[PDB]
Amino acid sequence: PPGPPGPPGPPGPPGPPGPPGPPGPP
Amino acid sequence: PPGPPGPPGPPGPPGPPGPPGPPGPP
Amino acid sequence: PPGPPGPPGPPGPPGPPGPPGPPGPP
Numbered sequence: 001p002p003g004p005p006g007p008p009g010p011p012g013p014p015g016p017p018g019p020p021g022p023p024g025p026p
Numbered sequence: 027p028p029g030p031p032g033p034p035g036p037p038g039p040p041g042p043p044g045p046p047g048p049p050g051p052p
Numbered sequence: 053p054p055g056p057p058g059p060p061g062p063p064g065p066p067g068p069p070g071p072p073g074p075p076g077p078p
Binding site: 001002005006008012015018022023024025 | 034036038042
């Protein structure tokens with residue numbers, strides 16, 4: 001009989017950077 | 027007997043985007 | 053003899069969040 005499924009893969013890499021923040025005040 | 031387990035699965039997807047950056051200067 | 057190897061495992065989990073974005077504009 002076939003053996004069992006393998007273990008989970010590794011985590012993916014980090015996501016992309018966030019957007020720029022809001023401008024400073026006046 | 028049963029065969030050996032399969033190999034590891036593929037990497038997961040990339041993570042979510044990071045948060046917006048800090049406010050700009052005054 | 054032993055049966056064939058199992059199938060590959062499930063995918064890994066999603067990666068961590070990306071880094072913050074850069075500062076806002078003036």
